[PDB]
Design a protein around this ligand. Structure first.
Ligand SMILES: Cc1cc(CCCCCOc2ccc(C3=NCCO3)cc2)on1
Ligand SMILES: Cc1cc(CCCCCOc2ccc(C3=NCCO3)cc2)on1
Lengths: 40, 255, 273, 236, 273, 59, 40, 40, 59, 57
């Protein structure tokens, strides 16, 4: 129950439960498959 | 013609027969089983030597005399040197096991005496010094010899006072732990099956003992007239469902 | 539910009262196996003996004390009780301890209540109003050194601010590393020849630290902190024999030497009433 | 803003109340539970396991020997032991039953008292155990004893005898700390015929005695035990 | 509901007003059996005479007192009122007592309110703020000996902490051992020749103990505790004659010697108005 | 957090008010009731039994 | 609404609205009718 | 009604109403029947 | 007026609690979000990127 | 959720543990690519590492 009118006044947000490290761990242009050779 | 009385336990390449048993206790009514995945944490596949480790090792014999106070063995310590069980033990980082314990003591229908055979999960001993003196490692790792409660206090060792279970509780209440009596007039063996009991799924076999087996004379031994005043007590123990994990170099432990 | 059924004379070959205790069992014998009984009902459920109930009331687990005074020229705040801490543990005060050690492994959430009262043992014009700031300092966190260190910023560490005379209350989930807390541990932290033996090695949960936020007034004020702990959501495994001798140390089973006989000697014979 | 009124008791801390609190560790994930044999749910589960009674209390320092009730060969008509039934005191007090009863104020229910015989197998004996309900004195001779709850025990192959002290009471609860109005009786044991040892045998034989509660049992109104105290806080 | 029905002249052989009181009955005679009446309605239910209502308001049952002062060199805390107790009982203050003893057996839950106020009879700079800790000590529990014993840990015993000037309130279920509390008991605890006679033997419910949690300030502070008791969920059996003479003791029926006539003497004749 | 306002009378103790309170003895089980003849429910029940009047008050 | 778990913690009980004086006013073994003679 | 998000913050648990002493009172491997002989 | 009772902990400030508060700036409209590459949701996302270890610590 | 799957001996032409870090990627290698593993579950969600939680006290 929100007792207040504005959105800033609500409690903390709830877990992204998004999670996708590939923008950080695999930003390569041509896709690399694990097990296939790195450099062909 | 089956009696509660006669029994055979075959485990590995070794068999025990008793013709004067008094049933058998299975701690907390649970039988040893391997470690399920749902309970697993370490990602390593474990090693299950099976029949080469799950057989019966008979420790060296003790001698019950009228002055005996009782003996105490720790597991897996007592077996630290038995065959391949022991090797596996020093060579893996983690291991887990249940046991069948069979304590033997026969006499005649003229003797009297009664031993308590009890298994205590997590038996943390007390220092006889009091205060917060610790009990050094070696002292709580007697190996197959076990601890002799009628031996003298030593320094860095535990207290050996029987009315207090080596920890500040009374002998009389040890009966809350899985146990069985050997009453010469009834019984000649005691058998207890111990499931693996810990707060972690698998642990180190050398830095932590998870049960102490204790044999304590309670009604003093009384032999017939002009009989030799003593009887030997033998303890045979078999690891069951043993699993080892995290193999490597081979632990080096104090002393 | 019947507490006793009706039972009459017996002349059988079936004797429920003869057993063999050597087996390790406690055979479930009842009054009606050996006398003639009448029906009676239980009228009772055993509600108040549930382990949740047994361990579920607040017990005092710790009393400490800190003072508000001018720290000017104090070389060791910790030592002046300018703030103090507590190496969290539940085995220091021994009423709650005997209750927990009836079990080998125990698992529960904790609810803490902290009461703080002030004392002014020497001449003051008044009673000031102090705010306490007890903060949790887990293992591997910058321990605080003065009563007003950067530590107290506590940007990542839960801290509660309440007023002396009031009470603070909050609840911490079961923080154990394993599946249960060990009430006992017959092990070492590693196989060294001189390393400590017990649980203290196992149950090292970091400490709690208290301080007054207020600067000093002209008089000095003693604030004494009492921490209460209530187990909620209790789970207990493997019952053990109750503690008989007195305790000597947090975390070891050791009892004092030349202790006194714990079993009351009869004033009379075995035959005495 | 909703109008409220606060009642007497506001701000009090009652160690026995049960309410919600904010978690200091928001979002923390506890370690998974694994299976451990032995879970206890009720103290009523454990007081049904029997434990030994130091009946032979006559020593002067605690010894393994106060658990042993001695028996003499060839005595006739005589008395083996006697005790009142204040389960919260005296012999009972250090037993697990005694020890738990002490966490509660009131108890009601039946008790199970058993004796296991340890003499040579070629000996024999007949004993009588008698429960005397409140209202009479501890019996002074078997004749007196045998008129109340009793069991003739014949020592045989079957080593233990289980006597039940059936709940005999006006008032439905008794105090665990000894109280008169609330008192429960006496328990005595006498030779019915006599212990007889085989040839080549000699001396005393002993009985071990246990106590546990019947499924009948009720304990209520928790309190603090006289069995543990302290003078300064312990430290590590 | 009619309070009176309409009734007119009568000339009968059926006389409801002649009875025989020797029988032990009180025949239900009404105005309309002997005069001519008109209809009237009751307009009333008898709500406020229900026993739940009669015994259901808070009554003061006990006033005690404890003080906060330096215990240094006190050989007997109990004796210095460093803490005090109360041998629980409901018959000590006699307003509520006469009300309960209108019945023989009574069964109810109790709601306690405890008011604590402080006094500073001799020169103080200020009024300190003290927290009281009244704790229930049932029969067979370590009675406390100093004002800061292990007892006060109260790990298994319900205790409430509130501030002086405030009030504490909580409710305790019917703790009697039997089905009802005996307001009277014509018995003994056993058939001894010299054992006490009454209820005191029956109604021994253990005592309540109070203390201040605060250490001492420079002045002394008197705290006076008033316990109020309200019966809720009342059940009462067997009405008795009301108490006529004054009371002398908790738990005995005894009245004082050379007491005064309790029936008011007429100022005049039997014939007087 | 829901916004509240406290009214006059907050914190007072009125010996005649009737509200809920925490039980000090959580989970305790009272003794069963047995039957006892004579239960009274209203004081109006008993004032209908007649009793003697010391009319001759002149002593 | 009870906020508490135990029954002792609930407020006062509610009126018996039972009321039967005859156990006290007419405990006679043979029933007496008003108007009929007391002793026959 | 829970007012708080985490489970630790809820009140006490509710009675097991589990109760099974046999793991403690009868941990024997071959079942013993009351009335039948203990040792056969 | 609805009857209330306050519990232990009233008035405390726990830096880790999560409740509602009045907004000081009623009705204010925040700047629109635009898209920015790189959003992080969990610290678990970033500790999977490898970084160099100063293994040769001997300086 | 499985934290580790069961995996046994390998003698392949497909080597997941040889990579080229010069590319800037951190290849998602697991215990089961280089030792024999057993199944285990995560039992955990990563709740308390959410940035809302990290900056939210
Ligand atoms: C066995 C056993 C069980 C326990 C209790 C462990 C409790 C976990 C850590 O306790 C705390 C205490 C205080 C705080 C706290 N946070 C903000 C203020 O206090 C957090 C966790 O200790 N030994
Ligand atoms: C007759 C009759 C009826 C009564 C009242 C009995 C009440 C039961 C015991 O009373 C208490 C009192 C205080 C507390 C208490 N617990 C925490 C603080 O106070 C508990 C029970 O006394 N005589």
């Amino acid at each position: 129950i929100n007792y207040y009118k504005d959105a800033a006044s609500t409690s903390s947000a709830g877990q992204s439960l998004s999670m996708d490290p590939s923008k950080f761990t695999e930003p390569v242009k041509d896709l690399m498959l694990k097990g296939a050779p790195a450099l062909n | 013609g089956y009696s509660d009385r006669v029994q055979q336990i075959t485990l590995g390449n070794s068999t025990i027969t008793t013709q004067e048993a008094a049933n058998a206790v299975v701690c907390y009514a649970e039988w040893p089983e391997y470690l399920p995945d749902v309970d697993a944490s370490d990602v390593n596949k474990t090693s299950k030597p099976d029949t080469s480790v799950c057989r019966f090792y008979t420790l060296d014999s003790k001698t019950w005399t009228t002055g005996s106070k009782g003996w105490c063995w720790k597991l897996p310590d007592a077996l630290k040197d038995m065959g391949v069980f022991g090797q596996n033990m020093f060579f893996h980082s983690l291991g887990r096991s249940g046991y069948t314990v069979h304590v033997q003591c026969n006499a005649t229908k003229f003797h009297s005496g009664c031993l308590l055979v009890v298994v205590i999960p997590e038996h943390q001993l007390a220092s006889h010094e009091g205060g917060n003196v610790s009990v050094k490692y070696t002292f709580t790792h007697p190996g197959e010899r076990g601890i002799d409660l009628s031996s003298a206090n030593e320094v860095g060792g535990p207290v050996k006072d029987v009315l207090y279970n080596m920890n500040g509780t009374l002998l009389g209440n040890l009966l809350i732990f899985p146990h069985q009596f050997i009453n010469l007039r009834t019984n000649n063996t005691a058998t207890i099956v111990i499931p693996y009991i810990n707060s972690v799924p698998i642990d180190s076999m050398t830095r932590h003992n998870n049960v102490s087996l204790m044999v304590i004379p309670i009604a003093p031994l009384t032999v017939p007239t002009g009989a030799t005043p003593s009887l030997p007590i033998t303890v045979t123990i078999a690891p069951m469902c043993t699993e080892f994990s995290g193999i490597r170099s081979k632990s080096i432990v104090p002393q | 539910t019947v507490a006793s059924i009706s039972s009459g004379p017996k002349h059988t070959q079936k004797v429920p009262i003869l057993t063999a205790n050597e087996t390790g069992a406690t055979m479930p014998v009842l009054p009606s196996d050996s006398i003639e009984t009448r029906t009676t009902y239980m009228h009772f459920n055993g509600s108040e003996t549930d382990v949740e109930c047994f361990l579920g009331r607040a017990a005092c687990v710790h009393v400490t004390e800190i003072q508000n005074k001018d720290a000017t020229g104090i070389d060791n705040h910790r030592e002046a009780k300018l703030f103090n801490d507590w190496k969290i543990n539940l085995s220091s005060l021994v009423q709650l301890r005997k209750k927990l050690e009836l079990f080998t492994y125990v698992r529960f959430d904790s609810e803490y209540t902290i009461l703080a009262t002030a004392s002014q043992p020497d001449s003051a014009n008044y009673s000031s109003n102090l705010v306490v700031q007890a903060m949790y300092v887990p293992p591997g966190a910058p321990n605080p050194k003065e009563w007003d260190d950067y530590t107290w910023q506590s940007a990542s560490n839960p801290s509660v601010f309440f007023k002396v005379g009031d009470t603070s209350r909050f609840s911490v989930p079961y923080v154990g590393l394993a599946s249960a807390y060990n009430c006992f541990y017959d092990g070492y932290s590693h196989d060294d020849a001189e390393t400590q033996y017990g649980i203290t090695v196992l149950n090292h949960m970091g400490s709690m630290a208290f301080r007054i936020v207020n600067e000093h007034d002209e008089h000095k004020t003693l604030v004494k902190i009492r921490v209460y702990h209530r187990a909620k959501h209790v789970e207990a495994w493997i019952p053990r024999a109750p503690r008989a001798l007195p305790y000597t140390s947090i975390g070891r089973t050791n009892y004092p030497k030349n202790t006194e006989p714990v079993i009351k000697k009869r004033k009379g014979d075995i035959k005495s009433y | 803003g909703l109008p409220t009124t606060t009642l007497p008791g506001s701000g009090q801390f009652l160690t026995t109340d049960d309410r919600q609190s904010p978690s200091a560790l928001p979002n923390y994930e506890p370690t998974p539970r694994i299976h451990i044999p032995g879970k206890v749910h009720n103290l009523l589960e454990i007081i049904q396991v029997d434990t030994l009674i130091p009946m032979n209390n006559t020593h002067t320092k605690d010894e393994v020997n106060s658990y042993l009730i001695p028996l003499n060969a060839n005595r006739q008509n005589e008395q083996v032991f006697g005790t009142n039934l204040f389960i919260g005191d005296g012999v009972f007090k250090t037993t697990l039953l005694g020890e738990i009863v002490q966490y509660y104020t009131h108890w009601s229910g039946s008790l199970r008292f058993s004796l296991m015989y340890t003499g040579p197998a070629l000996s024999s004996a007949k004993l009588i155990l008698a429960y005397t309900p409140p209202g009479a004195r501890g019996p002074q001779d078997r004749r007196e004893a045998m008129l109340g709850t009793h069991v003739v025990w014949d020592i045989g192959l079957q080593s233990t005898i289980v006597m039940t002290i059936p709940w005999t009471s006006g008032v439905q609860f008794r105090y665990t700390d000894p109280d008169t109005y609330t008192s429960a009786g006496f328990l005595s044991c006498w030779y019915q015929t006599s212990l007889i040892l085989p040839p080549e045998t000699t001396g005393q034989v002993y009985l071990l005695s246990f106590i546990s509660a019947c499924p009948d049992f009720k304990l209520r109104l928790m309190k603090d035990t006289q069995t543990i105290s302290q003078t300064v806080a312990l430290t590590e």
